[PDB]
Design a protein around this ligand. Structure first.
Ligand SMILES: Nc1nc2c(ncn2[C@@H]2O[C@H](COP(=O)(O)OP(=O)(O)CP(=O)(O)O)[C@@H](O)[C@H]2O)c(=O)[nH]1
Ligand SMILES: [Mg+2]
Lengths: 48, 48
């Protein structure tokens, strides 16, 4: 997440990263995030 | 706030009345408000 530059990853003591996250950083006009299950939804705040 | 919201509005689409389906989050913290979500939406259009 520090290499990405923005804090949007689960980080804590113990077992946290418990599933392979395939991130794809892509280029566009402005920033958001989309999964492959909340199709259509545009997550924008990284706490969410 | 009013100036910056439209500055962000045209910083992504331009001045040629194009739109973007990427929301703009905003949080007003005040002792005079609930924990409410007000979703302002763009006007509906039929001809481009
Ligand atoms: N003081 C300190 N703490 C660190 C440092 N790097 C990581 N930590 C701490 O390690 C803990 C877990 O961080 P995290 O990167 O999420 O570990 P992880 O690799 O995701 C655990 P797993 O991969 O097994 O799911 C956090 O509490 C974090 O603060 C560091 O450089 N200094
Ligand atoms: Mg981990």
């Amino acid at each position: 997440e520090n290499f990405v530059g923005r804090d949007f990853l689960p980080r804590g003591s113990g077992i946290v990263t418990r599933r392979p996250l395939v991130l794809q950083l892509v280029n566009a006009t402005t920033e958001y995030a989309e999964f492959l299950h909340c199709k259509g939804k545009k997550f924008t705040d990284f706490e969410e | 706030v009013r100036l910056e919201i439209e500055a962000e509005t045209d910083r992504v689409t331009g001045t040629n009345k194009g739109i973007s389906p990427v929301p703009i989050n905003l949080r007003v913290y005040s002792p005079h408000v609930l924990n409410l979500t007000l979703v302002d939406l763009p006007g509906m259009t039929k001809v481009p």
